[PDB]
Amino acid sequence: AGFIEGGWTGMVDGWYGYHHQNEQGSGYAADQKSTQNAINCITNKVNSVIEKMNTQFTAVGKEFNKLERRMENLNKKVDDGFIDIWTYNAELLVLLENERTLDFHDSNVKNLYEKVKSQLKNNAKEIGNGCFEFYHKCNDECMESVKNGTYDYPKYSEESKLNREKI
Amino acid sequence: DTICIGYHANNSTDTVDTVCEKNVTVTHSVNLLEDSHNGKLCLLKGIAPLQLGNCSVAGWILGNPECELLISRESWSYIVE
Amino acid sequence: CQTPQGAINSSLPFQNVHPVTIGECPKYVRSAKLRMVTGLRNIPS
């Protein structure tokens, strides 16, 4: 159950979250702060793509007789130019923004992984599949303190060192 | 005791196009293209438009006897023909 | 927004129903699909 392996489907509370395993209990959880930042950011981006557009009262359809052929050709040319520029700009813009959205989400995952790794530098063995297996045994307050960001090294340092010596 | 890092996934099969990729399956997306039409002519800026039934602009403004009843309208946003 | 084929809502910035538009209308495009992703990559577990 790691991020390199795939994506979880049980949790829907946030885009980003932790899975905790304990003797007392086992379940999923979600990082409200990280997800809230990201949801706000994506909302702002979508609003800017749709809102910055401001339409005015324009008439597109024009009528010209047989004598005014140059005017009809000019109107066709300017309409074709506008639609071609709009198509090219919109398609390249949406492709680039999709790539930014995926890149930003991956960067959020890597930032969360590096944060929890910097907090658990050597107290927990790293599986490499996205799982941090604790050497030291600690209950649910320990894991939610890891979620809280208030985990401390010296409290479980000696037990972790003994568990390294055992393995 | 293990702490795992993962991301949310669901049953949605929406396809998005990404530069450097194609047909990427994603959990949610928004559509900027409105290909739908009501299929009925409607008021524009809250003004009922003028209706021309089997009539032209010339027959409406010159006073064709078949087109006489359509002159009684006072305001219009656009003209259907 | 109003087109001869039918009425179009004016919320979204782009449309492809008809090139000839009357009033405050989204800009006409020839693109068949215009979707922006707001989520992550969907992969089964």
Epitope: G10, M11, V12, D13, G14, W15, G25, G27, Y28, A29, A30, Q32, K33, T35, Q36, I39, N40, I42, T43 | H8, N10, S12, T27, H28 | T38, G39
Partner: antibody, heavy 125, light 107 residues
Amino acid sequence: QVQLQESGPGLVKPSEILSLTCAVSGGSFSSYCWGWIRQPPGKGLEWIGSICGSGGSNYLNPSLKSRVTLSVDTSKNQFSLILNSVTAADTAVYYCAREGITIFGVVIPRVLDSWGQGAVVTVSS
Amino acid sequence: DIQMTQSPSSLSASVGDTVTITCRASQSISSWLAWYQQKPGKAPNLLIYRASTLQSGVPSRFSGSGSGTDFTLTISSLQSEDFATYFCQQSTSSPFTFGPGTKLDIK
């Protein structure tokens, strides 16, 4: 629109198991979290705890963490509250509600829309 | 954790008036807020989510805005059904505490 119906004992002695069962009609335990809200008489609302999915995500209040345990069973289609060591301060009108609102495919946390009509319970002699 | 305050505590207004209720938060909660109105003895209902948007099935007379530590809810025309109490809720972290409540009354 989902319909929420809750059943309660209506009376509870001090210091035993207090259990209420909330049933939902027209909805399932899929992609929507479910939570419990209680109000004391004449005081403001507060959040006891929330379950989401089918037993996957469990959230509890820090003050009531040891006291409340949330259990679900989709086959019978109810979610229930289990409370031990009940006190006189627990006299409240229990509300069960659905976390039905969502933005961009996420279920906003703890923003409730449709609740139940309420089941009153008092702790007394 | 994130302490919630409301102002004014009690307000009275007639039918058709404009009333602004300002719930205030101890620490920045960004744009995340829930507004609930509670009829006496009935289930509270959702009014405003994200402090700027309207939940469907709610009349459009209600409007909310604000950012930072200060937020406002503005009602244009206040009818008889809108005289119930109102609540302010934050949604960024546990515990998800609620506002003390603001009561509305005729004159």
